[PDB]
Structure formats: C-alpha cells, structure tokens
C-alpha cells in the first residue's frame, strides 16, 4: 500500500486480482458505499448547521454618531475574526480526521483480509498477497465478498506451503 492506483475509478478502496482467468481491479462495494455515505453526511452536516437569518449587515451613521460607528466596526471585526479562526480550525481538523479515517479504512480492509486467510496467502510487505493454493474467479469473488471458507482450501494451502 505504498503507491496509488490509477486503474481503479469505481471506488476509493478496492482490490486487484490476476489469475489464469484474467486480471483487473474491483472496488469493494460495502466499504466504498459506507465511506461515501459517511463523507456525504459529514459534508451535509458542515453545510447545513450554518443557521441563516434575514439580516442587513452594515448600518450608516452620521458624523456626530462616530462612537456608534466605531462600536459597529468593532463588532464586525470581532465577528470576522471569530468566523475566520473557527473556519480555519474546523477545516484543518476535518481534513486531518478524513485522512486518518481513510488510512484506518485501508488498514481495516487489510486486517480483515489477513484475518480471513491467516495462512493461505504469503505476505510480500507491500500490501499484496500471494495465494499458495490455486485460486479461480470464484475464489477471488468469495474473498472480496468476505464469505471465504477456510477449511475448503486450508489443506491445499498447507500442501503448497510445505513444498518449499
């Protein structure tokens, strides 16, 4: 999980398969859908919570009433500073949390795959897996869907691993 993938444009997270029946990239439906829903909800919550009322910012004053004009300027400057500081901090925190959440999702998918197999795939260290036993399209679909059966291919994986 070092470099990005330009061959996957149907999902933020997904897998790449390659066997005797072909090769390609396939986005994981459930994880991508959950991430999309959560990000959309975050954006909608950020945008919607800004309550707006019919107001008229900016009041004209006479030359004599300079004190009230200075008070209005001070109020406007205070509101501007508060809004700028709060918006900057919110944007920074949200960006950091989103990046951390994406990294956590990738790590969780990797951990889920490793927990599902736990012996069947040699780890290269770059996020890839090398299946000891022969795997077809059905096996790849079962692994991606999460319904992989350990004892069905455990014997074959052990036999292939004990060869070396």
């Amino acid at each position: 999980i070092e470099g990005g993938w330009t061959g996957m444009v149907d999902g933020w997270y997904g897998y790449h398969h390659q066997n005797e029946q072909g090769s390609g990239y396939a986005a994981d439906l459930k994880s991508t859908q959950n991430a999309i829903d959560k990000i959309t909800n975050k954006v909608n919550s950020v945008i919607e919570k800004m309550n707006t009322q019919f107001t008229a910012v900016g009041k004209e004053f006479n030359h004599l009433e300079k004190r009230i004009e200075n008070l209005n300027k001070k109020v406007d400057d205070g509101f501007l500073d508060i809004w700028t500081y709060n918006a900057e901090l919110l944007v920074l925190l949200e960006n950091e949390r989103t990046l951390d959440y994406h990294d956590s999702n990738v790590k969780n998918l990797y951990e889920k795959v490793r927990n599902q197999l736990k012996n069947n795939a040699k780890e290269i260290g770059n996020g890839c897996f090398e299946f000891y036993h022969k795997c077809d399209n059905t096996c790849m679909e079962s692994v991606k869907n999460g319904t992989y059966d350990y004892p069905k291919y455990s014997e074959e994986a052990k036999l292939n691993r004990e060869k070396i």
């Epitope: 149907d10 398969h17 986005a27 999309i36």
Partner: antibody
C-alpha cells in the same frame, strides 16, 4: 453523442463457438462499465452479462455461467464476448451498452442500468 | 425473483396511460428501477433514470414514480410516434443480476 460499433454476427452451427466485438468512441471507455443484453426475435429483452469499468468484476446470469467469456481492453477501447457451446436458444439480437455513472466527489460509482445502447448484432444457430 | 408486467396497454390519442411494474419486496425497495422504450426494429432508449429523472432528449410528458414495491410510468399527450414497447429493469443483489420484464405493448 457516444458512438458504438458492433460486429461479429453471422450463422454458426450448434455446438460451435462465436466472437462478438464492441468498439466505443466519444467517451472514456475505462471509466464506464459495459453490458451485453440479448433480445429474442419477437420477444422481450433479456440481460446476459456485464463487466465493470475497471474490469476485474464480471457478472453473468445463471444461464450463461461457464459458457460466455468477457474480455475488455482499455488501451484499444474494445470489448470481446466469446460464446462457446452454442444452442438454438442463442439465436437473438445482442446489444452492447454502457452503464450509468454517479459523480460522487469526482468518483464514478457504477449504477446498474443502461444509458446509451448500440445497434444490434443478429446471431442465428 | 421475477418481474411481471401487463401484456398490453391501450389508450386514445391525446390521453394519458399508466404502466405498472412489480417485483420482490426484498430487492425492489432497496435498489432503483429503470423504464426503457424500444421502437419497432430499433435500438431501445432509456426513459426513466433514478426513478425520478430522465435523460436528455426525453420529453417532459413522461413521468415516473415508485411507491412501495410498485413502479408506475405515466405517459401524457399520447401521439402516433409514442406507440412503442416499454420495459422495466431492476437489479437483484441476492442473485446479482439485472432483471427485465416481459414488455408492454401500447396502443
């Protein structure tokens, strides 16, 4: 306006093999999934098979599993459908179509459906 | 799961007609539906998108709705050119397949 060209039709004896080719232009072929849908002469439509935009995900129905193969090339923007063990029921008009894409934060989410159809290739057995 | 449609529909010119589409409650409610129009010997064209919208070039007279497990397609301002076949398409995740109806004939 997208353009789709379909070829490979003709007459094939029962139990033989056949190949269908679909070429696309006017849109990025690597960012949209594809579908092959057949229609019997005088009957309704019948979805046959499909492949994801980035490949790696081939969807087949129960009546075509183990019989039809889908292979797409994004560099040539071509799609090949190979049919084996042909039967008299296979005589129909096949259509190559693109899928719908939802734009979510610059990401194209595949939606099950057909936006623009091809022209139709008649296969008789 | 299977999809059922009326064998045919009838309507005088200038009136409105309704086409009904039904299916299994497990998949129809969760997923979306599509209505397609096919002419005589011509390539079918999409009519109903995302259960509420339509692609470009589709006249506004067509309308679509989805209540419960039943989808309804309404056609107003019926014309001679509007006489064509209509199909209902859904997606099923239990079988992971695109299901199409038997087709409806409008006259």
């Amino acid at each position: 306006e997208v353009q789709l060209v379909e070829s490979g039709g003709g007459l094939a004896k029962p139990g033989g093999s056949l190949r269908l080719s679909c070429a696309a232009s006017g849109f990025t072929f690597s960012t949209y999934a594809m579908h092959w849908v057949r229609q019997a002469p005088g009957k309704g439509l019948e979805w046959i098979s499909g492949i994801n935009s980035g490949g790696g995900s081939t969807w087949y129905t129960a009546s075509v599993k183990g019989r039809f193969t889908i292979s797409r090339d994004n560099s040539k923007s071509t799609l090949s459908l190979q049919m084996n063990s042909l039967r008299t029921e296979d005589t129909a008009v096949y259509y190559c179509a693109k899928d719908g894409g939802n734009a979510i934060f610059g990401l194209v989410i595949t939606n099950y459906g057909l936006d623009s159809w091809g022209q139709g290739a008649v296969v008789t057995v | 799961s299977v999809l059922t449609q009326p064998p045919s529909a009838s309507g005088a010119p200038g009136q409105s007609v309704t086409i009904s589409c039904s299916g299994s409650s497990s998949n129809f409610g969760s997923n979306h539906v599509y209505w397609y129009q096919q002419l005589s010997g011509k390539a079918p064209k999409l009519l109903i998108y995302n259960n509420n919208r339509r692609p470009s070039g589709v006249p506004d007279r067509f309308s679509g709705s989805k209540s419960g497990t039943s989808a309804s397609l309404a056609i107003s301002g019926l014309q001679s050119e509007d006489e064509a076949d209509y199909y209902c398409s859904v997606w099923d995740s239990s079988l992971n397949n695109v299901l199409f109806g038997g087709g409806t004939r409008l006259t």
